[PDB]
Amino acid sequence: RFLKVKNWETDVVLTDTLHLKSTLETGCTEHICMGSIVLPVRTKDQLFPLAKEFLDQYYSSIKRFGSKAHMDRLEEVNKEIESTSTYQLKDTELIYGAKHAWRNASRCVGRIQWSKLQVFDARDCTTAHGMFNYICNHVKYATNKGNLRSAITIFPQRTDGKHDFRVWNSQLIRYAGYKQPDGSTLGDPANVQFTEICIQQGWKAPRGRFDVLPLLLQANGNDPELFQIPPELVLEVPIRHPKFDWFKDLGLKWYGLPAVSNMLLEIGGLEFSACPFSGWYMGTEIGVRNYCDNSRYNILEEVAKKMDLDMRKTSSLWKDQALVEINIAVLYSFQSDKVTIVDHHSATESFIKHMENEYRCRGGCPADWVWIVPPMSGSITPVFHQEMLNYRLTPSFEYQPDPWNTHVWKG
Amino acid sequence: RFLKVKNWETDVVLTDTLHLKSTLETGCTEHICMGSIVLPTKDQLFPLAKEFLDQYYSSIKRFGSKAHMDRLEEVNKEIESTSTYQLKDTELIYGAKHAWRNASRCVGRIQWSKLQVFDARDCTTAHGMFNYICNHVKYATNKGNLRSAITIFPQRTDGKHDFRVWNSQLIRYAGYKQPDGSTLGDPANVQFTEICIQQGWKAPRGRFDVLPLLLQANGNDPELFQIPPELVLEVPIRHPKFDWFKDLGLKWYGLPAVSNMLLEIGGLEFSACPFSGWYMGTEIGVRNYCDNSRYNILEEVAKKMDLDMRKTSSLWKDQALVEINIAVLYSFQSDKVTIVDHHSATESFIKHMENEYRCRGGCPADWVWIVPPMSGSITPVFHQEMLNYRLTPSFEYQPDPWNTHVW
Ligand code: HEM
Ligand code: HEM
Ligand SMILES: Cc1cc(N)nc(C[C@H]2CNC[C@@H]2OCCNCCc2cccc(F)c2)c1
Ligand SMILES: Cc1cc(N)nc(C[C@H]2CNC[C@@H]2OCCNCCc2cccc(F)c2)c1
Numbered sequence: 001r002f003l004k005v006k007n008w009e010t011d012v013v014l015t016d017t018l019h020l021k022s023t024l025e026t027g028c029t030e031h032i033c034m035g036s037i038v039l040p041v042r043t044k045d046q047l048f049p050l051a052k053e054f055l056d057q058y059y060s061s062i063k064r065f066g067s068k069a070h071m072d073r074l075e076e077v078n079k080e081i082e083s084t085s086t087y088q089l090k091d092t093e094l095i096y097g098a099k100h101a102w103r104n105a106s107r108c109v110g111r112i113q114w115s116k117l118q119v120f121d122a123r124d125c126t127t128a129h130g131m132f133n134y135i136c137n138h139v140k141y142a143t144n145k146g147n148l149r150s151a152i153t154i155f156p157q158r159t160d161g162k163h164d165f166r167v168w169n170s171q172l173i174r175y176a177g178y179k180q181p182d183g184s185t186l187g188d189p190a191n192v193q194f195t196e197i198c199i200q201q202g203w204k205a206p207r208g209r210f211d212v213l214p215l216l217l218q219a220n221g222n223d224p225e226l227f228q229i230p231p232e233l234v235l236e237v238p239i240r241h242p243k244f245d246w247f248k249d250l251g252l253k254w255y256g257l258p259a260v261s262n263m264l265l266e267i268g269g270l271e272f273s274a275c276p277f278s279g280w281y282m283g284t285e286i287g288v289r290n291y292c293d294n295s296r297y298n299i300l301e302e303v304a305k306k307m308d309l310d311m312r313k314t315s316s317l318w319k320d321q322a323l324v325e326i327n328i329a330v331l332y333s334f335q336s337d338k339v340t341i342v343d344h345h346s347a348t349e350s351f352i353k354h355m356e357n358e359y360r361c362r363g364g365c366p367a368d369w370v371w372i373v374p375p376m377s378g379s380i381t382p383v384f385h386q387e388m389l390n391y392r393l394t395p396s397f398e399y400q401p402d403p404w405n406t407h408v409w410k411g
Numbered sequence: 412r413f414l415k416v417k418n419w420e421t422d423v424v425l426t427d428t429l430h431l432k433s434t435l436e437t438g439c440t441e442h443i444c445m446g447s448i449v450l451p452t453k454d455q456l457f458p459l460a461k462e463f464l465d466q467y468y469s470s471i472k473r474f475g476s477k478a479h480m481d482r483l484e485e486v487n488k489e490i491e492s493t494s495t496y497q498l499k500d501t502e503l504i505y506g507a508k509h510a511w512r513n514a515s516r517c518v519g520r521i522q523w524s525k526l527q528v529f530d531a532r533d534c535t536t537a538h539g540m541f542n543y544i545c546n547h548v549k550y551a552t553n554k555g556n557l558r559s560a561i562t563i564f565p566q567r568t569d570g571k572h573d574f575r576v577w578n579s580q581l582i583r584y585a586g587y588k589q590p591d592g593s594t595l596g597d598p599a600n601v602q603f604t605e606i607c608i609q610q611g612w613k614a615p616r617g618r619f620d621v622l623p624l625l626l627q628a629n630g631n632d633p634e635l636f637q638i639p640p641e642l643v644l645e646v647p648i649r650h651p652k653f654d655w656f657k658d659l660g661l662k663w664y665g666l667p668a669v670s671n672m673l674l675e676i677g678g679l680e681f682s683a684c685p686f687s688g689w690y691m692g693t694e695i696g697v698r699n700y701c702d703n704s705r706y707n708i709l710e711e712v713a714k715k716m717d718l719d720m721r722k723t724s725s726l727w728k729d730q731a732l733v734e735i736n737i738a739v740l741y742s743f744q745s746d747k748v749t750i751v752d753h754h755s756a757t758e759s760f761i762k763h764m765e766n767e768y769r770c771r772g773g774c775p776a777d778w779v780w781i782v783p784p785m786s787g788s789i790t791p792v793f794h795q796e797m798l799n800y801r802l803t804p805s806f807e808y809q810p811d812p813w814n815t816h817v818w
């Protein structure tokens with residue numbers, strides 16, 4: 001069964017057959033669409049099927065389906081599972097696994113890049129200090145002095161779920177948030193809770209508006225430990241505007257490397273709970289969301305004041321006006337410092353080309369429109385006009401609850 | 412069964428129970444989400460009738476009553492005999508208000524109970540439809556002080572006697588292809604515009620030529636009519652700080668009046684039911700003006716602005732877009748024509764959602780359509796989880812009449 005998606009700006013129609021290979025569920029029913037809902041120990045029993053299916057994918061892609069190396073590997077995994085209950089991925093399968101999880105990430109507009117992922121195998125890691133080292137190396141490699149390179153570092157898979165490796169930070173680099181006694185917030189409001197945990201684990205907080213948080217790392221189910229990323233390793237870009245000279249005086253800066261550290265990577269039924277990955281920013285992530293969300297740094301008002309906009313009625317579009325300036329500033333600052341960044345026009349257009357190619361060669365590209373469309377200027381980017389079909393493929397990245405919610409403290 | 416929706420900017424959580432009353436299907440399955448796809452009998456009629464009337468009588472707090480039961484019999488007897496039935500005026504007003512109330516793509520629903528309903532079910536000809544329409548247009552325009560309205564033509568019978576307004580809006584501009592290969596006017600209406608000429612219309616072959624009405628009564632061939640020019644309120648488009656903006660020559664009409672939808676109440680189908688409210692600025696400034704396949708004017712506005720159009724990364728489109736939209740809101744307000752901005756509209760919709768959650772148990776809402784086509788995340792609807800589902804009464808789309816009409 002074939003499904004069609006139309007682009008209402010070009011009348012280009014596409015046929016999806018790939019959704020057919022989709023087993024996980026969406027949260028939707030024929031009676032309800034949950035398309036805008038943000039979040040809608042295994043058995044030997046369930047594991048070999050998931051293994052088989054993954055290895056069948058892998059082997060097809062290398063054009064070896066049904067080969068002897070294919071049959072043998074299935075038989076090998078099959079035995080390893082019954083004997084040991086889990087199984088180990090070959091390097092080749094891990095790489096392929098990790099690239100595919102990205103390729104399948106329906107909410108990611110950056111996917112045209114999926115096949116270029118640098119995979120770092122950290123499955124021999126045993127301790128938090130071991131993790132700090134792997135993470136430091138990932139940061140330096142990926143940062144590459146501003147010429148950012150995508151990368152993922154993969155720690156040991158879950159075994160009994162009592163020995164999980166976890167990166168407690170949501171991103172490797174993020175700024176502290178400090179709730180004050182007067183209810184206000186200093187720093188990033190999104191990171192207040194995590195910040196507190198760090199302080200409580202004995203982090204001495206400098207308490208500024210842009211303090212880079214320490215890494216809190218859990219190896220093998222043990223209590224997490226704190227570490228400071230070498231500062232010479234954290235590339236930051238001070239934010240200025242190409243015409244507004246007072247802009248720099250806002251004191252804004254941002255880190256250059258976005259690196260998601262709280263997701264679970266599932267491959268062939270295995271669960272890698274620590275698998276930080278990084279790319280480079282699309283400008284609106286910082287300029288729209290990070291700076292302008294009301295519950296983030298919320299600088300729209302102050303930027304608006306400085307521009308002397310009529311802030312007395314929303315119908316002056318002062319908010320919109322300040323938002324464009326701030327986003328101009330972000331892109332300007334990055335390009336000027338030669339740190340990789342991509343604007344939302346260029347990014348969304350790339351995604352369209354990527355998506356069409358994916359339909360052409362793969363029969364589909366699962367995409368979540370609520371997430372692919374940028375948080376400003378939606379309809380003047382080509383994805384807005386693009387119908388999309390959202391469904392779950394594996395390998396995949398998934399959310400997991402915050403570890404402080406689940407962790408058994410050893411004390 | 413009892414679903415929650417969280418607002419991620421305020422943390423407020425709402426519980427949805429109304430979705431259990433949902434009847435129609437979404438196009439989604441457990442395997443695949445179609446949330447961003449634009450379009451995913453005597454036996455049939457009585458269930459529908461019953462379910463509508465049960466909600467009507469319960470809404471008036473007469474559920475069960477003898478008045479309720481008698482009506483159920485009466486409609487039943489009439490279906491059984493006439494193979495269809497007629498709504499009381501009170502049911503027609505309720506039905507219409509509720510189809511708007513249930514429109515999950517409409518951000519403007521906070522207004523839903525104020526709909527002025529005009530019952531045109533006694534209409535029999537296209538000249539009659541024209542008259543009703545002109546009266547609707549004038550009442551709603553109200554010299555710039557728009558009032559929402561819907562005019563309802565006779566309901567479908569055998570379906571060889573449908574009333575239809577072939578226009579998609581009562582008021583839209585024409586579109587002509589040129590040997591040039593460019594498009595003059597509204598590229599969206601190019602086909603319809605042809606279908607008009609092919610029907611005898613003298614197109615002024617301009618950029619903002621108000622289309623003529625093409626009205627079809629009782630299944631007959633559709634007829635042309637020009638809306639009295641004086642009934643079409645239009646706003647010239649100027650900018651509160653760009654003098655040169657006037658020169659772009661932009662104008663838009665004040666009355667958004669959707670005419671091609673089908674209103675279903677109690678299983679009865681009203682295929683001609685034009686309705687109208689008033690514009691949210693972005694509808695014109697973002698979509699009509701700047702959609703690539705619409706009047707697509709960003710390019711020129713950008714040039715007039717002397718912005719660096721060398722690289723996408725200057726955000727010159729984004730700059731021009733804000734300006735274009737400041738100018739629309741500016742123009743309407745200056746001329747005292749109702750218009751709402753996206754900040755105000757979405758904020759009022761969040762209030763409406765909350766009212767609906769506590770008053771009705773929920774509010775079907777299609778996030779893909781409710782989030783404005785500019786500055787998404789700086790509007791509060793961006794951060795609002797919404798549950799989308801189909802309730803009746805409803806407005807549905809219907810095939811273009813010309814693919815359907817037998818001349
Ligand atoms: C190369 C530059 C990249 C860009 C510009 C990019 C862009 C984005 C953006 C804008 C989002 C939306 C999330 C939000 O705004 O909250 C996103 C989500 C996501 N990206 Fe990418 N991405 C890139 C690279 C990567 C890489 C290397 C991976 C993994 C290998 C990845 C995996 C994902 C995943 C799993 C999501 C969904 C995350 C969530 O659900 O919050 N991305 N990406
Ligand atoms: C009074 C002020 C109103 C505002 C600001 C408003 C706003 C909007 C907007 C922005 C949309 C999305 C439009 C698009 O971009 O295509 C929409 C869709 C819709 N509106 Fe409202 N509206 C208003 C009044 C009404 C009234 C009076 C009705 C019916 C009585 C109505 C019924 C609908 C329906 C059924 C849709 C979905 C149409 C579709 O699926 O294409 N609206 N509205
Ligand atoms: C690797 C990479 C590169 C890039 N440019 N961009 C990204 C997305 C992250 C950065 N900027 C925001 C995204 O971070 C992930 C944000 N959190 C997940 C969404 C979520 C789920 C459930 C509950 C919530 F509250 C939130 C990744
Ligand atoms: C009554 C009212 C007031 C208002 N402010 N705004 C509105 C929305 C209309 C005007 N601005 C666009 C909407 O008109 C509906 C346009 N088409 C429906 C979507 C669709 C489906 C299938 C195929 C297509 F090509 C298009 C109505």
Ligand SMILES: C[C@H](O)[C@H](O)[C@H]1CNc2nc(N)[nH]c(=O)c2N1
Pocket residue numbers: 035036037038370371372419778793794795796797
């Ligand atoms: C409720 C709503 O789905 C939620 O706010 C989503 C909308 N789209 C998004 N899109 C991206 N890229 N990032 C986000 O955090 C969100 N938030």
Ligand SMILES: C[C@H](O)[C@H](O)[C@H]1CNc2nc(N)[nH]c(=O)c2N1
Pocket residue numbers: 008384385386387388447448449779780781
């Ligand atoms: C493909 C996508 O569904 C389509 O472009 C939708 C998205 N959201 C929309 N939202 C509104 N209000 N109006 C539209 O015409 C559309 N188009």
Ligand SMILES: [Zn+2]
Pocket residue numbers: 028032033034035439443444445446
């Ligand atoms: Zn859905």
